[PDB]
Design an enzyme around this catalytic site. Structure first.
Site, PDB file in Angstrom:
ATOM      1  N   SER A  42       0.800  -1.246   0.000  1.00  0.00           N
ATOM      2  CA  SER A  42       0.000   0.000   0.000  1.00  0.00           C
ATOM      3  C   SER A  42       0.815   1.270   0.000  1.00  0.00           C
ATOM      4  O   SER A  42       0.241   2.362  -0.043  1.00  0.00           O
ATOM      5  CB  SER A  42      -0.910   0.082   1.208  1.00  0.00           C
ATOM      6  OG  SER A  42      -2.006  -0.816   1.045  1.00  0.00           O
ATOM      7  N   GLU A 142      -4.526  -7.490  -6.149  1.00  0.00           N
ATOM      8  CA  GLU A 142      -3.499  -8.294  -6.813  1.00  0.00           C
ATOM      9  C   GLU A 142      -2.085  -7.803  -6.529  1.00  0.00           C
ATOM     10  O   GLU A 142      -1.156  -8.607  -6.514  1.00  0.00           O
ATOM     11  CB  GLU A 142      -3.703  -8.335  -8.321  1.00  0.00           C
ATOM     12  CG  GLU A 142      -4.819  -9.284  -8.775  1.00  0.00           C
ATOM     13  CD  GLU A 142      -6.211  -8.663  -8.704  1.00  0.00           C
ATOM     14  OE1 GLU A 142      -6.358  -7.425  -8.451  1.00  0.00           O
ATOM     15  OE2 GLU A 142      -7.171  -9.447  -8.903  1.00  0.00           O
ATOM     16  N   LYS A 208       3.168   6.362   5.496  1.00  0.00           N
ATOM     17  CA  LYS A 208       2.223   5.513   4.782  1.00  0.00           C
ATOM     18  C   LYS A 208       2.740   4.086   4.868  1.00  0.00           C
ATOM     19  O   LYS A 208       3.874   3.817   4.502  1.00  0.00           O
ATOM     20  CB  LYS A 208       2.106   5.935   3.315  1.00  0.00           C
ATOM     21  CG  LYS A 208       1.210   4.975   2.503  1.00  0.00           C
ATOM     22  CD  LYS A 208      -0.277   5.251   2.808  1.00  0.00           C
ATOM     23  CE  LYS A 208      -1.172   4.057   2.435  1.00  0.00           C
ATOM     24  NZ  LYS A 208      -1.133   2.940   3.468  1.00  0.00           N
ATOM     25  N   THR A 209       1.901   3.183   5.371  1.00  0.00           N
ATOM     26  CA  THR A 209       2.295   1.788   5.553  1.00  0.00           C
ATOM     27  C   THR A 209       1.977   0.927   4.330  1.00  0.00           C
ATOM     28  O   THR A 209       1.274   1.361   3.412  1.00  0.00           O
ATOM     29  CB  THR A 209       1.531   1.189   6.747  1.00  0.00           C
ATOM     30  OG1 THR A 209       0.119   1.417   6.546  1.00  0.00           O
ATOM     31  CG2 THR A 209       1.981   1.833   8.057  1.00  0.00           C
ATOM     32  N   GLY A 210       2.538  -0.284   4.302  1.00  0.00           N
ATOM     33  CA  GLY A 210       2.084  -1.290   3.346  1.00  0.00           C
ATOM     34  C   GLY A 210       2.184  -2.642   4.006  1.00  0.00           C
ATOM     35  O   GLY A 210       3.121  -2.882   4.772  1.00  0.00           O
TER      36      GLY A 210
HETATM   37  C1  LIG Z   1      -1.955  -2.162   1.413  1.00  0.00           C
HETATM   38  O1  LIG Z   1      -0.735  -2.612   1.926  1.00  0.00           O
HETATM   39  C2  LIG Z   1      -3.158  -2.987   1.827  1.00  0.00           C
HETATM   40  N1  LIG Z   1      -2.767  -4.402   1.953  1.00  0.00           N
HETATM   41  C3  LIG Z   1      -3.591  -5.359   1.520  1.00  0.00           C
HETATM   42  O2  LIG Z   1      -4.702  -5.133   1.027  1.00  0.00           O
HETATM   43  C4  LIG Z   1      -3.063  -6.790   1.650  1.00  0.00           C
HETATM   44  C5  LIG Z   1      -3.219  -7.261   3.094  1.00  0.00           C
HETATM   45  C6  LIG Z   1      -4.331  -7.438   3.818  1.00  0.00           C
HETATM   46  C7  LIG Z   1      -4.126  -7.864   5.092  1.00  0.00           C
HETATM   47  C8  LIG Z   1      -2.845  -8.049   5.439  1.00  0.00           C
HETATM   48  S1  LIG Z   1      -1.914  -7.653   4.066  1.00  0.00           S
HETATM   49  C9  LIG Z   1      -3.806  -2.290   3.049  1.00  0.00           C
HETATM   50  N2  LIG Z   1      -2.778  -1.723   3.933  1.00  0.00           N
HETATM   51  C10 LIG Z   1      -2.343  -2.146   5.132  1.00  0.00           C
HETATM   52  C11 LIG Z   1      -1.261  -1.239   5.675  1.00  0.00           C
HETATM   53  O3  LIG Z   1      -0.680  -1.508   6.730  1.00  0.00           O
HETATM   54  O4  LIG Z   1      -1.028  -0.235   4.992  1.00  0.00           O
HETATM   55  C12 LIG Z   1      -2.811  -3.293   5.789  1.00  0.00           C
HETATM   56  C13 LIG Z   1      -2.240  -3.729   7.170  1.00  0.00           C
HETATM   57  O5  LIG Z   1      -2.698  -4.883   7.782  1.00  0.00           O
HETATM   58  C14 LIG Z   1      -2.033  -5.497   8.836  1.00  0.00           C
HETATM   59  C15 LIG Z   1      -2.276  -6.997   9.060  1.00  0.00           C
HETATM   60  O6  LIG Z   1      -1.275  -4.887   9.602  1.00  0.00           O
HETATM   61  C16 LIG Z   1      -3.863  -4.207   5.155  1.00  0.00           C
HETATM   62  S2  LIG Z   1      -4.953  -3.331   3.972  1.00  0.00           S
END
Ligand SMILES: *C(=O)[C@@H](NC(=O)Cc1cccs1)[C@@H]1NC(C(=O)O)=C(COC(C)=O)CS1
Length: 265
Positions: A42, A142, A208-210
């Site tokens: 993300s 995806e 901003k995390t991912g």
């Molecule tokens: C972007 O990284 C996005 N990730 C996903 O949709 C894939 C995942 C869903 C669950 C785990 S990975 C969104 N961003 C973040 C983030 O931290 O920016 C998420 C964080 O989730 C956890 C677990 O810490 C998931 S949704």
């Protein structure tokens, strides 16, 4: 020794860790696996919002975007709640950054437009900032799923740090748009246990995390010392050794950031 400390964390978390902090005034660049590719996850949403801001008049933020059931394909904390009414571009930017909202990001990609549902234009925006490394090929969900080593949907700690530096500290955006991006990152809700956890309370952190499959956990930040000296911090990680369902481990990023903060203090 910093490289030794990062290697220790890799062993502790059965992880691959990448770190970049650009050189400043009087600090050398901090780099560990900084030119290795890691999935954006993300984190792409920060330059995505910059791209949308750059591309349009500021009042494009007030345009209402409508969407439907079949658009909700990923974690979308805000978009799921507003599906019945639509969301403005400004609301979508807010959600994409502060809640890492996948639907919001997909709608913003579509707003940017062009081939690949906006992914080609997103990549072109990075190229305009001199990033010849990163690439976005898919949208949510995806883009989080490419096998370990695959170059699709990747950046590097080095590349994304230089991009973020231009966006927040440099002149990639006019001041008004720069401020909008900065404030959204400043108000992020998803980052408390990552870079933020590694810096003392009197340092400002925006981020901003991912997070993705194969134990992927990233965070990109701009931090400011108590005296207003800014640094860009990019930390990326995966745990490919646990396969697709490997748990992301935020604590790895918090420890890595603590090590970085020790050097920057
Ligand atoms: C972007 O990284 C996005 N990730 C996903 O949709 C894939 C995942 C869903 C669950 C785990 S990975 C969104 N961003 C973040 C983030 O931290 O920016 C998420 C964080 O989730 C956890 C677990 O810490 C998931 S949704």
């Amino acid at each position: 020794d910093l490289a030794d400390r990062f290697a220790e964390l890799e062993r502790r978390y059965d992880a691959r860790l990448g770190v970049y902090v650009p050189a400043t005034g009087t600090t050398a660049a901090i780099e560990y696996r900084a030119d290795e590719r890691f999935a954006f996850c993300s984190t792409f949403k920060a330059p995505l919002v910059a791209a949308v801001l750059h591309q349009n008049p500021l009042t494009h933020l007030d345009k209402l975007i409508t969407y439907t059931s079949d658009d909700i394909r990923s974690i979308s904390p805000v978009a799921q709640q507003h599906v019945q009414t639509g969301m403005t571009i400004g609301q979508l930017c807010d959600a994409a950054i502060r809640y890492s909202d996948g639907t919001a990001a997909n709608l913003l990609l579509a707003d940017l437009g062009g081939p690949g549902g906006g992914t080609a234009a997103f990549t072109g925006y990075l190229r305009s900032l001199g990033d010849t490394v990163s690439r976005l090929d898919a949208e949510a969900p995806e883009l989080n799923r490419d096998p370990p080593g695959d170059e699709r949907d990747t950046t590097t700690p080095h590349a994304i740090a230089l991009v973020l530096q231009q966006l927040v500290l440099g002149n990639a955006l006019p001041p008004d748009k720069r401020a909008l991006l900065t404030d959204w990152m400043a108000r992020n809700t998803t980052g408390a246990k990552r870079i933020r956890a590694g810096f003392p309370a009197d340092w400002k952190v925006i981020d901003k995390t991912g997070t993705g499959d194969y134990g992927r956990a990233n965070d990109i930040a701009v931090v400011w010392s108590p005296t207003g000296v800014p640094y860009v911090v990019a930390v990326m990680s995966d745990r490919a050794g646990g396969g697709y369902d490997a748990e992301p481990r935020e604590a790895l990023l918090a420890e890595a950031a603590t090590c970085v903060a020790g050097v920057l203090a």
